[PDB]
């Protein structure tokens, strides 16, 4: 039981690091979506 | 996370220190110069009758 408890605790910690990494990745992806929609605006403006 | 902590080398040093501590716990049990759990224990039998 102590083995399982400690394993689940360190797993909670590692999962927290994983959620943080995924949050950074999703933030970068949202930034890239903004940049891409900006390129779309410049492209449709470039119709001229 | 299988890719995040580039100091798995430091992790290896620390777990090596841990296993050396294990081997040291194996030793230093010199209860009579007849080390109990490490080395060569004769597997004795205490007489009670």
Curated annotation (Swiss-Prot), chain B:
Subcellular locations according to the entry: Secreted; Bacterial flagellum
Domain of life: Bacteria
Protein name, per record: B-type flagellin
The protein's role, per its UniProt record: Flagellin is the subunit protein which polymerizes to form the filaments of bacterial flagella.
Family membership: Belongs to the bacterial flagellin family.
Post-translational modification (record): Phosphorylated on tyrosine residue(s).
